[PDB]
């Protein structure tokens, strides 16, 4: 099917407590494969998935060199942005940057992305054409004009359409057992009595990969959207994910309710009933 590679960078200033904290992580689909942390001891990009461990020292030295260079530019940016917004030297601020590429189910380039946030709000983003920018603020216009003048979009577009997807395809092949896999949800229901006239039915999906899943309840085949408690999909810690959906069922009505599970790992969508 379709795949993505994404890198996520966070820099946080720490006035009076030394250098800003800088953390970088990379993912292929929903699997993390590398990290860098400015505060940590190694000062190296580090593997976080088993398939990338075989890459070898030119890869690790080069990704270390590049990530340290990203760290420096984000350190400079914190200073620049405090100036653009006329903010005092005292407060902590946050810069975030995300970039990467998607390929379709033919493994060909589909979409590329590069966006930047300051203090949790959109700051500047590369448009879908990979040729122009969307600037949120008056302050971001300065950045937009500077990046237009230095032809930054052109350099990003070359990477997103070429290098990014080539390396995504490399990773998909080298990590085929981890990345071209699906783990189907293992499912069950629980039933707990709220009072003497109703009970909570909870539909569980566990140990699934990728994270994308649809869990719904129906009553007599009508969707119960407004009356379903649904939790955010959450990591198990072992590379798989979990979710549940619950409804409140009045007495004797359990047979009216069905839980429906849609997931790429399933041969057919599931319909589950308490019975």
């Amino acid at each position: 099917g379709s795949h993505s590679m994404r890198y996520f960078f966070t820099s946080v200033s720490r006035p009076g407590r030394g250098e800003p904290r800088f953390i970088a992580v990379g993912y292929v689909d929903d699997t993390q494969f590398v990290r860098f942390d400015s505060d940590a001891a190694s000062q190296r990009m580090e593997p976080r998935a088993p398939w990338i461990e075989q890459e070898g020292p030119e890869y690790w030295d080069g990704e270390t060199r590049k990530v340290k260079a990203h760290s420096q530019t984000h350190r400079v940016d914190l200073g620049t942005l405090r100036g653009y917004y006329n903010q005092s030297e005292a407060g902590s601020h946050t810069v975030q940057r995300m970039y990467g590429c998607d390929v379709g189910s033919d493994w060909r380039f589909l979409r590329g992305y590069h966006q930047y946030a300051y203090d949790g709000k959109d700051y500047i983003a590369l448009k879908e054409d990979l040729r122009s920018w969307t600037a949120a603020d008056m302050a971001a216009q300065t950045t937009k004009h500077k990046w237009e003048a230095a032809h930054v979009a052109e350099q990003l577009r070359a990477y997103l359409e070429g290098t990014c997807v080539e390396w995504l395809r490399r990773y998909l092949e080298n990590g085929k057992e981890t990345l071209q896999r699906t783990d189907a949800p293992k499912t069950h229901m629980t039933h707990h009595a709220v009072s003497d006239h109703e009970a909570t039915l909870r539909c569980w999906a566990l140990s699934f990969y990728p994270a994308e899943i649809t869990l719904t309840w129906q009553r007599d085949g009508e969707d119960q959207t407004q009356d379903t408690e649904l939790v955010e999909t959450r990591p198990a810690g072992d590379g798989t994910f979990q979710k549940w959906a619950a409804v409140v069922v009045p007495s004797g009505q359990e047979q009216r309710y069905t839980c429906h599970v849609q997931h790429e790992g399933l041969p057919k969508p599931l319909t589950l009933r308490w019975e």
């Binding site: 890198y7 990704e63 990530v67 530019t73 620049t80 500047i124 500077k146 930054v152 290098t163």
Partner: peptide, 9 residues
């Protein structure tokens, strides 16, 4: 693989 070129806002 990371992008190799640098830019500043």
């Amino acid at each position: 693989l990371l992008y190799g070129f640098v830019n500043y806002v």
